[PDB]
Homo-oligomer: A and B are copies of this chain.
């Protein structure tokens, strides 16, 4: 097959499709599109439905985990992620230090090179949130990152942000390194004045995400960038293996997976247009 012929003129849909069939790494991008659609459309087989016990009220579908770096949140992918969570396309998110604060920061101003006053407005917001927890919430028992991120989403109440829609649709966001980013800087500065009594526990979040993989009927994993989450998620047999479906995208036993050597902010919106934006997700009601 040949690449796009500019003798025809300019057709951006054909230009995009031409990349998917002739570009460098196009075969891997195509597998990624096929694998993600399999996550969305997966249904139990008739033999599998027989294995379900009475009272097993779980949704009989693929649980979908979305991992991305804080760097992706800085790009326009943030609004792609908002769309995915707004429409319940994924069930859980794993991300890295700085991602949550970037999502909040983009609700106040546009990052061109970040203005001084934009960081200060974000820091002031985070600090008021930290202080509100102390005054109203009970500080004698620690919060987890996912719980703090839920509370921040509800407090922010901005429909352009990922975290507001994650709190609305009960999509849990894990971020073990939350205190290593601007959120942690705000803790440090607040403590220099008024002793900070907030505590952050990591064990409960560790138990949530591992219980969710162990107890899910089928697993799908999409990871954008390097350093997010571990590829091997624990099975229902207490064995750390890959997921049933896995897509890995970055520039660095019957599982179906692919690694795409590409930059996510360029290829992932293209992949979304051929998967999440057109494929209806199975509701799991059997």
Contact = CB atoms under 8 A, between A and B. Distances in A.
Contact of A207 (B10, B26, B187, B276): B187
Interface string A219-245: 000000001001000100010100000
A157 interface: no
Nearest to A14: B12
Contacts of A24: 71, 75, 263-266
Contacts of A86: 7
A199 B192 CA distance: 25
Q: How many copies does the complex hold?
A: 4
Contact of A184 (B141, B189, B206): B206
A124 interface: no
B200 A269 contact: no
B187 A273 contact: no
Contacts of A25: 263
Interface of A: 1-7, 10, 12-13, 15-16, 18-19, 21-26, 71, 75-80, 83, 86, 106, 110, 139-142, 160, 176-177, 179-180, 184-185, 187-189, 191-192, 195-196, 198-204, 206-207, 210-211, 214, 227, 230, 234, 238, 240, 251, 262-267, 269-270, 272-273, 276-278
Shortest 5 CB-CB distances between A and B: which pairs? Answer: A3-B76, A22-B76, A12-B13, A3-B79, A23-B265
30 contacts: A1-B76, A1-B110, A2-B76, A2-B106, A3-B269, A4-B76, A5-B79, A6-B83, A6-B277, A10-B273, A10-B277, A19-B265, A19-B266, A22-B76, A22-B79, A23-B75, A23-B266, A24-B264, A24-B265, A176-B177, A191-B207, A191-B210, A192-B238, A199-B201, A199-B204, A200-B202, A227-B227, A262-B266, A263-B263, A263-B266
